[PDB]
Design a protein around this ligand. Structure first.
Ligand SMILES: CN(C)C(=O)Cc1c(C(=O)O)n(Cc2csc3ccc(F)cc23)c2ccccc12
Ligand SMILES: [Zn+2]
Length: 226
């Protein structure tokens, strides 16, 4: 998160810190959010050979009792996830066990409504991602309020699609989700509407978020089947 604030610790108790293992490189990290006690939603590009989720974190470098380090038993990457277009950059992680609900860990279930969120409002995204291009991932959960932009603000992402994705972050500001924030929720009035997907390497907003409304059926499908 660039240009954000440190979250009040544990104020976003659904936030998941994902450590994503691959065979051929060191861990990568993503965010995500717990939408059921045993499911974390994140970005598909956060898939890996295995993923650990840490719930209850604030400073991810400082173990604390709020932490729940949970094994992911299965990744449900959106079947249409396209590594070229980055369409359908969404993934559900089924945790091996249901997380404990604590003050610091709770789910963020979707409201029934899955209304398409038009441009214009401010939403908040949180993550432990980089706080600038040259900055490592934040030890602490950060969050930033970003403007939902009209889709044309993301035109330059040539595979951006307004129906699939939110365009997030006023380009006039440096505030943005960034690397390491992948998979984090964009909450608009406390409702997850976006998932950090991608943006420019140089961190110039807007960034592209998966538009959750579009994937609600798929999410539901996975949740109901698993
Ligand atoms: C498993 N991971 C994390 C990786 O493989 C590396 C990776 C990252 C990352 O490092 O976060 N992002 C997000 C990202 C890149 S530039 C940018 C700008 C603004 C913004 F919000 C997000 C982003 C990806 C998107 C698609 C494919 C891969 C990645
Ligand atoms: Zn704490």
């Amino acid at each position: 998160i660039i240009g954000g604030t440190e979250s009040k610790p544990h104020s976003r108790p659904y936030m998941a810190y994902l450590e994503i293992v691959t065979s051929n490189g060191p861990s990568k990290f993503c965010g995500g959010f717990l939408i059921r006690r045993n499911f974390v939603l994140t970005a598909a590009h956060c898939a890996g050979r295995s993923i650990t989720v840490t719930l209850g974190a604030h400073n991810i470098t400082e173990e604390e009792d709020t932490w729940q380090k949970l094994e992911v038993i299965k990744q449900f990457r959106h079947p249409k996830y396209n590594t070229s277009t980055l369409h359908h950059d969404i993934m559900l992680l089924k945790l091996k066990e249901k997380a404990s609900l604590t003050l610091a860990v709770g789910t963020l279930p979707f409201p029934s409504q899955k209304n398409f969120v038009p441009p214009g409002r401010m939403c908040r995204v949180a993550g432990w991602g980089r706080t600038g291009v040259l900055k490592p991932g934040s030890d602490t959960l950060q969050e930033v309020k970003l403007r939902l932009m009209d889709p044309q603000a993301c035109s330059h992402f040539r595979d951006f699609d307004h129906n699939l994705q939110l365009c997030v972050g006023n380009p006039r500001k440096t505030k943005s989700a960034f690397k390491g924030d992948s998979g984090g929720p964009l909450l608009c009035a406390g409702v997850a509407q976006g998932i950090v997907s991608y943006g420019r390497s140089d961190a110039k907003p807007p960034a592209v978020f998966t538009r959750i409304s579009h994937y609600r059926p798929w999410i539901n499908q996975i949740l109901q089947a698993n």
